[PDB]
Design a protein around this ligand. Structure first.
Ligand code: A1IGK
Ligand code: MG
Ligand code: ZN
Ligand code: ZN
Ligand code: ZN
Ligand code: ZN
Lengths: 285, 131
């Protein structure tokens, strides 16, 4: 029994050396015997490998005192309706040196904002994990023909996460002390969040008494939506998956049951708008 | 396509430490809250007639230790996150780590909490002979 979380997406026909494999599963077959591994002097470590590691399959069901839960109940999301931001990501597929994972390409929000990111992955090396640009291809299809030009109009993630924090801060400073991302089939969005979200115990702003919604790696400091200028990370966000509310079909068909003013332009921000719209109609009518 | 590296028993803890600002504190707090230790480490079949040093190029477990592949005992390697040292490189990946048999249930936690004596090469409190 295995998971897709941290799946090795390289095309290397061998596993890893016992000293370099992150897990027993990833050790090369030559080293395995009786449920354990053996060191084989004469079969050396690899010092040049680059192995793309998949960020699909995160499970945020931790129960740790002092750490808030990311996924909240419908009743708690209702109480924080002013914090609702619809969120959707259109991804691209890993290609050439790797195959088997999706990388964020277009991040859409119910504020109408679309951000294009350079296809970046988590690549294991003999020394560390290297967060770097990877070869990617837009999904095989014609409804994703709008993504083909975006493969060259993307920004590095260090800029993208700064723009997300800036947009959320501009939108939510006068509305709420939190953010609640409103999702439909949260899997890929949660994967995308690894690229711009950090978690931990509840903190206060460095400049005021309001709770911290942002974090800066550069200064190791926390800030509210009012003082997050220059901040790169979303800190302790909340979220909910509208798909899990007992809906039979897809996002568009359920949204169109209540609303006729949000046509499908087939962009990430459009799905994010439809998600928040459906959540409002379902929760308050 | 691709090759699975993990088991479902590690999903919660790896996901939690993968998103944390301070992964080390997150893992210790996870254990303190009753969470299970990270499993699926690279445990070695060895003679147990080794030198007993803490971090070695070959398994060096003695009769009181278990040998493991170093990357599998590193929280930062296990979560695919940044390493805390200024150079950003690992000291366990590429080596073998000898863990006391009494602590073999949580190899990741042991390496996070303990230090290697720079004089004798043994773990402080677990084999370090000098003061
Ligand atoms: C040929 N590839 C493998 O044996 C492998 C297995 C698990 C994780 C990474 C690589
Ligand atoms: Mg979408
Ligand atoms: Zn503030
Ligand atoms: Zn609508
Ligand atoms: Zn490491
Ligand atoms: Zn010593």
């Amino acid at each position: 029994n295995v998971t897709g979380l941290f799946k090795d997406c390289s095309k290397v026909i061998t596993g890893l050396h016992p000293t370099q494999a992150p897990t027993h599963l990833s050790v090369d077959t030559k080293f395995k015997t009786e449920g354990l591994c053996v060191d084989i002097p004469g079969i050396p470590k690899d010092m040049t490998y680059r192995r793309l590691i998949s960020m699909m399959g995160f499970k945020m069901n931790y129960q740790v005192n002092g750490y808030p839960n990311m996924f909240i109940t419908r009743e708690e999301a209702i109480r924080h309706v002013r914090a609702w931001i619809g969120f959707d990501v259109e991804g691209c597929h890993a290609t050439r040196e790797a195959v088997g994972t999706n990388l964020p390409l277009q991040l859409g929000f119910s504020t109408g904002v679309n951000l294009v990111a350079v296809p970046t992955g988590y690549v294991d090396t003999p020394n560390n994990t290297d967060f770097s640009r990877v070869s990617a291809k837009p999904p095989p299809g014609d409804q994703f023909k709008h993504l083909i030009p975006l493969m060259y109009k993307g920004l590095p993630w260090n800029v993208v996460r700064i723009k997300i924090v800036q947009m959320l801060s501009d939108t939510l400073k006068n509305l709420s002390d939190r953010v609640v991302f409103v999702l439909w089939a949260h899997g890929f969005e949660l994967t995308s969040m690894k690229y711009f979200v950090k978690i931990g115990p509840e903190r206060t702003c460095c400049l005021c008494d309001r709770r911290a919604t942002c974090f800066s790696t550069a200064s190791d400091t926390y800030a509210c939506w009012h003082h997050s200028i220059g901040f790169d990370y979303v800190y302790n966000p909340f979220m909910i998956d509208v798909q899990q509310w007992g809906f039979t079909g897809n996002l568009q068909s359920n949204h169109d049951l209540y609303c006729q003013v949000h046509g499908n332009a087939h962009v990430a921000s459009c799905d994010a708008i439809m998600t928040r719209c459906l959540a409002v109609h379902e929760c308050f009518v | 396509a691709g090759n699975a590296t993990e088991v479902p028993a590690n999903s919660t803890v790896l996901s939690f430490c993968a998103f944390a600002v301070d992964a080390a504190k997150a893992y210790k707090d996870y254990l303190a809250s009753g969470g299970q230790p990270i499993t699926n480490c690279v445990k070695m079949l060895c003679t147990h007639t080794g030198t007993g040093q803490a971090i070695t190029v070959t398994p060096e477990a003695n009769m009181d230790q278990e040998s493991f592949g170093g990357a599998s005992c590193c929280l930062y390697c296990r979560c695919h996150i940044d390493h805390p040292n200024p150079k950003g490189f690992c000291d366990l990946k590429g080596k073998y780590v000898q863990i006391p048999t009494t602590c073999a249930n949580d190899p990741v936690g042991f390496t996070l909490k303990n230090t290697v004596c720079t004089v004798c090469g043994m773990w402080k409190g677990y084999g370090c002979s000098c003061d």
